[PDB]
Amino acid sequence: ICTTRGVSSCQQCLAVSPMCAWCSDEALPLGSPRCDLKENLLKDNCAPESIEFPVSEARVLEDRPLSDKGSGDSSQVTQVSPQRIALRLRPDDSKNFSIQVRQVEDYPVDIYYLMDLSYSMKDDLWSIQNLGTKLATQMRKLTSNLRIGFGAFVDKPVSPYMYISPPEALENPCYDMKTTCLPMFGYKHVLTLTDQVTRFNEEVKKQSVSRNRDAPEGGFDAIMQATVCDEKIGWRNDASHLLVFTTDAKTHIALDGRLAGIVQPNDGQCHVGSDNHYSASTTMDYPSLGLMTEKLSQKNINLIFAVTENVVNLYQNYSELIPGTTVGVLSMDSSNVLQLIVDAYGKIRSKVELEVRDLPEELSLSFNATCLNNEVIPGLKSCMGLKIGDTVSFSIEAKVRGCPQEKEKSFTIKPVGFKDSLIVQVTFDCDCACQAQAEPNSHRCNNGNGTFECGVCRCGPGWLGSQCECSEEDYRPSQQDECSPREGQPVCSQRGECLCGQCVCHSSDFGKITGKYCECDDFSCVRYKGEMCSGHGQCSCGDCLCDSDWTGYYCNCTTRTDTCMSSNGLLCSGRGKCECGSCVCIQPGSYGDTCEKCPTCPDACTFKKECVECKKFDRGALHDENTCNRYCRDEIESVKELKDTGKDAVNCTYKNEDDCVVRFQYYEDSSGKSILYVVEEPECPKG
Amino acid sequence: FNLDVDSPAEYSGPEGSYFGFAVDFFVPSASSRMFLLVGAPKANTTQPGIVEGGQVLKCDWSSTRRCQPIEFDATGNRDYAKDDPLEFKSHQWFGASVRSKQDKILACAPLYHWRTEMKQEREPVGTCFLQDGTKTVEYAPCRSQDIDADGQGFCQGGFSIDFTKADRVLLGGPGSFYWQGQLISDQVAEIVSKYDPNVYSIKYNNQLATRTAQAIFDDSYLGYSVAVGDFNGDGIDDFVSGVPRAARTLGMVYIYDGKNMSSLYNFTGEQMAAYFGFSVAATDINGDDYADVFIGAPLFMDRGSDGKLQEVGQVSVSLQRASGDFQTTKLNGFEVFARFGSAIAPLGDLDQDGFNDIAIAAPYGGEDKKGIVYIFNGRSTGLNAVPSQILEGQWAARSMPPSFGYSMKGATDIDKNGYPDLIVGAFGVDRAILYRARPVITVNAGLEVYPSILNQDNKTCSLPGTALKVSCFNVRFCLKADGKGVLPRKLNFQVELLLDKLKQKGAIRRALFLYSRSPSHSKNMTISRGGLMQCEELIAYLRDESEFRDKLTPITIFMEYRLDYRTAADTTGLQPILNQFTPANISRQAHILLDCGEDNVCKPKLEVSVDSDQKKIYIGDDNPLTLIVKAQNQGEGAYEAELIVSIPLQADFIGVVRNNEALARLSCAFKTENQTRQVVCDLGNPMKAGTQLLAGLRFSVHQQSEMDTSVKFDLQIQSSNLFDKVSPVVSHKVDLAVLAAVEIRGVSSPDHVFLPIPNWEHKENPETEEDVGPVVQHIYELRNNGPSSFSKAMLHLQWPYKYNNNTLLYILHYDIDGPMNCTSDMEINPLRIKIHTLGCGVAQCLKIVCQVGRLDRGKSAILYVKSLLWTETFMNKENQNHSYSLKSSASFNVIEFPYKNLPIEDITNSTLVTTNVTWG
Ligand SMILES: *[C@@H]1O[C@H](CO)[C@@H](O[C@@H]2O[C@H](CO)[C@@H](O[C@@H]3O[C@H](CO[C@@H]4O[C@H](CO)[C@@H](O[C@H]5O[C@H](CO)[C@@H](O)[C@H](O)[C@@H]5O)[C@H](O)[C@@H]4O)[C@@H](O)[C@H](O[C@H]4O[C@H](CO)[C@@H](O)[C@H](O)[C@@H]4O)[C@@H]3O)[C@H](O)[C@H]2NC(C)=O)[C@H](O)[C@H]1NC(C)=O
Ligand SMILES: *[C@@H]1O[C@H](CO)[C@@H](O[C@@H]2O[C@H](CO)[C@@H](O[C@@H]3O[C@H](CO)[C@@H](O)[C@H](O)[C@@H]3O)[C@H](O)[C@H]2NC(C)=O)[C@H](O)[C@H]1NC(C)=O
Ligand SMILES: O=C(CCCCc1ccc2cccnc2n1)NCC[C@H](NC(=O)c1nc2ccccc2s1)C(=O)O
Ligand SMILES: *[C@@H]1O[C@H](CO)[C@@H](O[C@@H]2O[C@H](CO)[C@@H](O)[C@H](O)[C@H]2NC(C)=O)[C@H](O)[C@H]1NC(C)=O
Ligand SMILES: *[C@@H]1O[C@H](CO)[C@@H](O[C@@H]2O[C@H](CO)[C@@H](O)[C@H](O)[C@H]2NC(C)=O)[C@H](O)[C@H]1NC(C)=O
Ligand SMILES: *[C@@H]1O[C@H](CO)[C@@H](O[C@@H]2O[C@H](CO)[C@@H](O)[C@H](O)[C@H]2NC(C)=O)[C@H](O)[C@H]1NC(C)=O
Ligand SMILES: *[C@@H]1O[C@H](CO)[C@@H](O[C@@H]2O[C@H](CO)[C@@H](O)[C@H](O)[C@H]2NC(C)=O)[C@H](O)[C@H]1NC(C)=O
Ligand SMILES: *[C@@H]1O[C@H](CO)[C@@H](O)[C@H](O)[C@H]1NC(C)=O
Ligand SMILES: *[C@@H]1O[C@H](CO)[C@@H](O)[C@H](O)[C@H]1NC(C)=O
Ligand SMILES: *[C@@H]1O[C@H](CO)[C@@H](O)[C@H](O)[C@H]1NC(C)=O
Ligand SMILES: *[C@@H]1O[C@H](CO)[C@@H](O)[C@H](O)[C@H]1NC(C)=O
Ligand SMILES: *[C@@H]1O[C@H](CO)[C@@H](O)[C@H](O)[C@H]1NC(C)=O
Ligand SMILES: *[C@@H]1O[C@H](CO)[C@@H](O)[C@H](O)[C@H]1NC(C)=O
Ligand SMILES: *[C@@H]1O[C@H](CO)[C@@H](O)[C@H](O)[C@H]1NC(C)=O
Ligand SMILES: *[C@@H]1O[C@H](CO)[C@@H](O)[C@H](O)[C@H]1NC(C)=O
Ligand SMILES: [Mn+2]
Ligand SMILES: [Mn+2]
Ligand SMILES: [Mn+2]
Ligand SMILES: [Mn+2]
Ligand SMILES: [Mn+2]
Ligand SMILES: [Mn+2]
Ligand SMILES: [Mn+2]
Ligand SMILES: [Mn+2]
The C-alpha atoms of residue B423 and residue B500 are separated, in whole angstroms, by 49
Amino acid identity, residue B825? D
Pairing of β B324-332 and β B35-40: unpaired
- The domain locations on chain A are 1-54+431-472, 55-105+350-430, 106-349, 473-559, 560-601, 602-687
**Do B71 and B105 sit in the same domain of this protein?**
yes
The C-alpha atoms of residue B500 and residue B587 are separated, in whole angstroms, by 10
Long-range CB contacts (within 8 A, 24+) of B598-602 = B600/B455, B601/B453, B601/B636, B601/B721, B601/B722, B601/B723, B602/B453, B602/B635, B602/B636, B602/B637, B602/B638, B602/B639, B602/B686, B602/B721
* Residue B613 contacts residue B630 (beta carbons within 8 Å): no
Residues 217-246 of B with CB under 8 A from A: 218-219, 221, 224, 244-245
The C-alpha atoms of residue A350 and residue A273 are separated, in whole angstroms, by 36
Kindly state the helix (H) or strand (E) to which residue B885 belongs, with its residue range.
Answer: strand B884-896
**Do B80 and B210 sit in the same domain of this protein?**
yes
* Residue B865 contacts residue B846 (beta carbons within 8 Å): no
Kindly state the helix (H) or strand (E) to which residue A585 belongs, with its residue range.
Answer: strand A582-585
The C-alpha atoms of residue B884 and residue B882 are separated, in whole angstroms, by 6
Amino acid identity, residue B792? K
The verdict on the CB of residue B816 being under 6 Å from ligand 3 is no
What CATH number has the domain spanning A106-349?
A: 3.40.50.410
**Residue B109: phi, psi to the nearest 5?**
-125, 90
The CA-to-CA distance between both ends of chain B, in Å, stands at 83
CA of B370 to the centre of ligand 5 (A): 26
The C-alpha atoms of residue A474 and residue A93 are separated, in whole angstroms, by 43
Q: Which residues of B touch A504 (CB under 8 A)?
A: 506-507
The C-alpha atoms of residue A527 and residue B589 are separated, in whole angstroms, by 29
**Residue A192: phi, psi to the nearest 5?**
-75, 155
| Peptide bond preceding A166 in cis form (omega within 30 of 0) | yes
The C-alpha atoms of residue A508 and residue B498 are separated, in whole angstroms, by 14
Positive or negative torsion for Cα A281, A286, A291, A295: positive
User: Strands across the sheet with B225-229, in order?
Assistant: B225-229, B238-243, B252-256, B263-268
Q: CA A608 → CA A448, A676, B738, distances in Å?
A: 85, 8, 42
Closest chain A residue to the Cα of B279, Cα to Cα: A255
Mutate to test the pocket of ligand 8, among A95, A367, A381, A395 (most ligand atoms within 8 A of CB): A395
Amino acid identity, residue A16? V
Q: CA A299 → CA A79, A352, A419, distances in Å?
A: 17, 17, 9
Kindly state the helix (H) or strand (E) to which residue A139 belongs, with its residue range.
Answer: helix A133-139
Measured torsion, CA atoms of residues B2, B8, B14, B15, in degrees rounded to the nearest 10: 70
* Residue A465 contacts residue A444 (beta carbons within 8 Å): no
Amino acid identity, residue A188? K
**Do B753 and B782 sit in the same domain of this protein?**
yes
**Do B339 and B409 sit in the same domain of this protein?**
yes
Which architecture, in CATH terms, is A473-559?
A: Ribbon (2.10)
Pairing of β B490-499 and β B469-470: unpaired
B340 touches chain A (CB under 8 A): no
- Our CA angle for B770, B775, B778, nearest 5°, is 160
* Parent domain of B519: 439-599
DSSP secondary structure letter of residue A617: S
Mutate to test the interface with A, among B114, B278, B308 (most CBs of A within 10 A): B308
**Which is nearest to A435 in space by CA: A1, A13, A88, A87?**
A13
- Rg of chain A taking only CA atoms, in angstroms: 34
Other CB atoms within 10 A of residue B858 CB: 11
User: Which of B113, B272, B299 has the CB atom closest to A255's CB atom?
Assistant: B299
Other CB atoms within 10 A of residue B320 CB: 21
Question: Between A289-298 and A220-228, two packed helices, what is the crossing angle to 10 degrees?
Answer: 30
| Peptide bond preceding B451 in cis form (omega within 30 of 0) | yes
CATH class of A602-687: few secondary structures
* Residue B294 contacts residue B358 (beta carbons within 8 Å): yes
The C-alpha atoms of residue B270 and residue B253 are separated, in whole angstroms, by 12
**Do B31 and B172 sit in the same domain of this protein?**
yes
**Which is nearest to A561 in space by CA: B303, B336, B330?**
B303
- Rg of chain B taking only CA atoms, in angstroms: 39
Boundary residue ending a domain (B537, B567, B599): B599
* Residue A596 contacts residue A566 (beta carbons within 8 Å): yes
CATH at residue B454: 2.60.40.1460
Other CB atoms within 10 A of residue A450 CB: 19
The C-alpha atoms of residue B144 and residue B151 are separated, in whole angstroms, by 9
The C-alpha atoms of residue A521 and residue A537 are separated, in whole angstroms, by 15
Q: How many CA atoms lie within 13 A of B644 on its CB side?
A: 18
* d(CA A433, nearest CA chain B) in Å: 31
CATH at residue B672: 2.60.40.1510
Name the E strands within B135-258.
135-139, 160-163, 168-173, 182-187, 208-209, 225-229, 238-243, 252-256
Amino acid identity, residue B102? Q
Residues sharing a CB contact under 8 Å with residue B431, sequence separation 6 or more, in sequence order: B10, B11, B12, B13, B19, B20, B395, B425
3-state secondary structure of A443: helix
A471 touches chain B (CB under 8 A): yes
User: Strands across the sheet with A326-330, in order?
Assistant: A187-194, A146-153, A109-116, A240-247, A301-308, A326-330
The C-alpha atoms of residue B408 and residue A42 are separated, in whole angstroms, by 68
**Do B358 and B464 sit in the same domain of this protein?**
no
Pocket of ligand 12 (CB under 6 A): A 509; B 560, 583-585
**Do B245 and B391 sit in the same domain of this protein?**
yes
Residue A216, marked binder = yes
What's the total number of domains in chain B? Answer: 4
Name the E strands within A143-290.
146-153, 187-194, 240-247
The C-alpha atoms of residue A576 and residue A589 are separated, in whole angstroms, by 11
* Residue B97 contacts residue B114 (beta carbons within 8 Å): no
What CATH number has the domain spanning A55-105+350-430?
A: 2.60.40.1510
How distant is the alpha carbon of residue B794 from its chain centre? 42
**Which is nearest to B281 in space by CA: B294, B272, B290, B268?**
B294
Region class of B399: left (phi > 0), else alpha (psi between -120 and 50), else beta: alpha
Other CB atoms within 10 A of residue B105 CB: 23
**Do B699 and B837 sit in the same domain of this protein?**
no
* Residue B425 contacts residue B408 (beta carbons within 8 Å): yes
**Do B529 and B396 sit in the same domain of this protein?**
no
CA of B260 to the centre of ligand 11 (A): 6
**Do B696 and B788 sit in the same domain of this protein?**
no
The C-alpha atoms of residue B368 and residue B424 are separated, in whole angstroms, by 18
Annotate A373-411 with b (16+ C-beta within 10 A) or e (fewer).
Answer: eeeebebbbbbbebebebbbbbebebbbbebeeeeebeb
The C-alpha atoms of residue A35 and residue A605 are separated, in whole angstroms, by 66
User: Which of A160, A528, A588 has the CB atom closest to B654's CB atom?
Assistant: A528
The C-alpha atoms of residue A79 and residue A401 are separated, in whole angstroms, by 32
* Residue A36 contacts residue A17 (beta carbons within 8 Å): no
How distant is the alpha carbon of residue B875 from its chain centre? 69
- Our CA angle for B909, B915, B919, nearest 5°, is 155
CA of A379 to the centre of ligand 21 (A): 45
Percent helix / strand / coil, chain B, rounded to 5: 0, 45, 55
* Residue A408 contacts residue A360 (beta carbons within 8 Å): no
The C-alpha atoms of residue B349 and residue B420 are separated, in whole angstroms, by 7
Residues sharing a CB contact under 8 Å with residue A332, sequence separation 6 or more, in sequence order: A123, A124, A248, A308
**Residue A226: phi, psi to the nearest 5?**
-70, -20
* Residue A520 contacts residue A512 (beta carbons within 8 Å): no
Boundary residue ending a domain (B709, B739, B769): B739
* d(CA B53, nearest CA chain A) in Å: 13
The C-alpha atoms of residue B236 and residue B234 are separated, in whole angstroms, by 5
The C-alpha atoms of residue B328 and residue B315 are separated, in whole angstroms, by 10
The C-alpha atoms of residue B657 and residue B362 are separated, in whole angstroms, by 44
Q: Do A589 and B781 touch (CB under 8 A)?
A: yes
User: Which of B18, B508, B658 has the CB atom closest to A472's CB atom?
Assistant: B508
The C-alpha atoms of residue B474 and residue A683 are separated, in whole angstroms, by 107
Pairing of β A422-428 and β A84-89: parallel
User: Which of A160, A605, A655 has the CB atom closest to B175's CB atom?
Assistant: A160
The C-alpha atoms of residue B361 and residue B341 are separated, in whole angstroms, by 6
**Which is nearest to B425 in space by CA: B136, B175, B67, B90?**
B67
Name the E strands within A248-375.
301-308, 326-330, 352-357, 363-370
B760 touches chain A (CB under 8 A): no
**Do B548 and B462 sit in the same domain of this protein?**
yes
3-state secondary structure of B786: coil
Give me the helices (H) in A229-358, please. Answer: 230-233, 289-298, 312-319, 337-348
The C-alpha atoms of residue A394 and residue A397 are separated, in whole angstroms, by 10
Residues sharing a CB contact under 8 Å with residue B833, sequence separation 6 or more, in sequence order: B766, B767, B768, B769, B772, B810, B812, B868
Q: What is the DSSP string of A493-541?
A: SSSS---TTS-------SS-EESTTS-EESS-S-BSSSSBGGGSEEEET
**Do B178 and B291 sit in the same domain of this protein?**
yes
The CA-to-CA distance between both ends of chain A, in Å, stands at 81
Annotate A347-357 with b (16+ C-beta within 10 A) or e (fewer).
Answer: ebbbbbbbbbe
Q: Which residues of B touch A265 (CB under 8 A)?
A: 337, 339, 364, 401
Residues making up the annotated binding site of B are 230, 232, 234, 236, 238, 284, 286, 288, 290, 292, 349, 351, 353, 355, 357, 413, 415, 417, 419, 421
3-state secondary structure of A445: helix
Q: Which residues of B touch A401 (CB under 8 A)?
A: none
